[PDB]
């Protein structure tokens, strides 16, 4: 479960990566 500065985006089929709007970065990692 993400602490949202991060947003839940899936890549087209399966996978979710946590992406932050303020820093503008896509990470596979959960802080």
């Amino acid at each position: 479960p993400l602490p949202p500065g991060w947003e839940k985006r899936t890549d087209s089929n399966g996978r979710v990566y946590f992406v932050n709007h303020n820093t503008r970065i896509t990470q596979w990692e959960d802080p």
């Binding site: 890549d11 990566y17 992406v19 503008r24 970065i25 896509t26 990470q27 596979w28």
Partner: peptide
Amino acid sequence: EEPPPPYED
């Protein structure tokens, strides 16, 4: 070894 997707909606 995977790339990240770029931040662009």
